[PDB]
Amino acid sequence: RLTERAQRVLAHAQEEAIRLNHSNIGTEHLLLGLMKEPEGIAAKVLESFNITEDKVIEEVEKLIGYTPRAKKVIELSMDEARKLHHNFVGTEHILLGLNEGVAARVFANLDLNITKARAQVVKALGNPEMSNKNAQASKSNNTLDSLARDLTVIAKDGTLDPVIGRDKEITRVIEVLSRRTKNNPVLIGEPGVGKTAIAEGLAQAIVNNEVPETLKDKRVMSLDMGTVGEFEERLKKVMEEIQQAGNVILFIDELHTLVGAASNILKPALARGELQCIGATTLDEYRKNIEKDAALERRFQPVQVDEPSVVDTVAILKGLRDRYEAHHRINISDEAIEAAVKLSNRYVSDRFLPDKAIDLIDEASSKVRLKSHTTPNNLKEIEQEIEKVKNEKDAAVHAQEFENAANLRDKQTKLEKQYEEAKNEWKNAQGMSTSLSEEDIAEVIAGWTGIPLTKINETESEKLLSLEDTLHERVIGQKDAVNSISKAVRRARAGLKDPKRGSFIFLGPTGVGKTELARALAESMFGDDDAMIRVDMSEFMEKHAVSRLVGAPPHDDGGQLTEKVRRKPYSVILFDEIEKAHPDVFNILLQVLDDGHLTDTKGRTVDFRNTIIIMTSNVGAQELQDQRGQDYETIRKTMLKELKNSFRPEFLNRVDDIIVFHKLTKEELKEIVTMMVNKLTNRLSEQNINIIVTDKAKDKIAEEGYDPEYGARPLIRAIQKTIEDNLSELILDGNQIEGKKVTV
């Protein structure tokens, strides 16, 4: 039938009949629709000559204080289709149909059909705009108080200060009011980290008035969420007032309203279908609270960026790099910014990097600022010079010294003699200036984590360089397999695997570097081995696939490890004896191997690629006859086949690498025992005691305990069994201690 040009406002002038509830649908539905709001859309050009638009609004709005007269206005409006050389009829020739639509009284809003309206048709384009670019009928074309306090005017002071970077984000925010659905995005995750300062980005657009054509009217107010007998009847009061005033928005500041003094206070007024504002909730509180309603989970749009990304933080950081510089009184060599984002990026597994890196602006800036806080030892030596006798200088006044005389003015002259030097070298020595990286990185995370080693130094031009080397220092051997890994998930790093996507097999007996270099492995990785978690795949069989996958058909025995790592922000996993099982289970252990995570039943989808899992085998004592010195390719290919006997390439094509044991010898026995000596060097020679290494006893007992069954691990205890008891010898000595050395 009709078009988009202001039949828009006749469909919603039929909503103006629903708005204004009148038994004659009046021209003030056409015009109090056509004037959508009391804003100056006065932009109708006829407030020049005779009749004010706002005067029409007031007097016809007192007349209320298609109605076939105005259904003939539909006709006379369609009569204007050929009168002014058009295709179609536009937006204000409704009013050029509005003979009847006048407030014709003593103050008549009688409407000029010609008078200077023809000069106003020399004004309006007319025959250029027939219709339809999509439809080109746009805008200017041819208690009310501290209960809702704001920051909008406070930003419009300029006192609130510009954060930067969220152009697309605040753009999204603009798009949310373009919904017909969900007028807030509940920013989830870590809100208010700067996401409150994203709202400062929004009021920042208000003070800019980059805030558009339309949205300059309504404004952000800050809610008062505090306590009073009843708290809430006042709030129900102020609801109808400012909601009736209706030219603002507010926040839920922190909490969705689930309280006792009540929860459903004006949550029914929300449920009245009204009231565009902003809520507040997090990731799992979207998942709890907002989803706990599932009408909250209906009504708002969940959006976040986190406690955020990289160059976002570079943006807002180098933008606020003047503001918080007016706080912390230092300013930046931006390599500190680089290394800061870089390192707390590498670190913080449970909290997030960047508002914690704003907190690094706090810690590091507070650190240089605390070589920069209080009165400035040699200036304090000058203060000792200020600090010999005023605090006892004087009393010769009290009685008859002929002596007041001397020592009085001796120390008058003598101090003031020795004084203004303090001013001179003090104002000189009141340090260097900008916030350098090196030590306001190194010193400060040394104030947090430490050692400018694995905990700080760690540029991976260092450890990726000496990587294979470094772990090969720990448990020697398998260096082929070592940089088969260090190579292998070297190219997990530099992004060349999937960002959510690694498994490594053992070939030997336990604790030969299985326990010990799976140990020393993760202890090299992030400096600490504690991440790594065990199930044998002799253990995960059928209903440890139940206690691996939660029940309801067969209990909450699901996950021997699930709820732990579910709570954890970081872990590493090692599993054992894989083709001790059959090709059937390798699909559920392959379900561990999936997803860029695992799907068990309990809690959360996250990354894989930050750390590693590891596999282990021991069965191939048969192919040790192959070792009894055939190659990597021979025996790895042999138990790559014998591997593949039970295995699945879905499952195996989630495993990275076959990892050998170069079974070990008595020599590697001797040398990991030599590492055990270097342990006691590393711990108990910290009393810095010298060491007799008697190779009689060493190769004696080493010769003894080279276990065919157990390998090396238990013997280590069986070393110390005597040996550290031998230390007790030494402990009960206190004599062959630091600097000296005995054994047999």
Residue numbers in the entry: 5 to 69, 80 to 112, 116 to 159, 162 to 247, 255 to 287, 296 to 464, 466 to 536, 539 to 587, ...
The authors write:
The ClpC-ClpP machinery acts in regulatory and general proteolysis, controlling multiple cellular pathways and differentiation processes and is crucial for bacterial stress resistance and virulence. Here, we report on an unexpected mode of AAA+ chaperone control involving transition between an inactive resting state and a functional hexamer as revealed by determining the cryoEM-structures of S. aureus ClpC in absence and presence of MecA.
The structure of ClpC on its own was solved at 8.4 Å resolution using ~90.000 collected particles. Indeed, reconstructions revealed that ClpC without MecA assembles into an oligomeric assembly made of two open spirals that interact via head-to-head contacts mainly mediated by the MDs. The AAA+ domains are staggered with a rise of ~20 Å per subunit. N-domains domains are packed between MDs and are displaced so that they lie on top of the adjacent small AAA1 subdomain. The MDs coiled-coils constitute the backbone of the spiral and mediate the spiral head-to-head contacts, which involve residues F436, R443 and D444 providing a structural rationale for the activated states of respective MD mutants. ATP addition caused formation of larger ClpC assemblies that eluted prior to ClpB hexamers and a 670 kDa standard protein, suggesting formation of ClpC complexes larger than hexamers. As MecA-binding sites in N- and M-domains are not accessible in the resting state, we suggest that ClpC subunit dissociation is prerequisite for MecA binding.
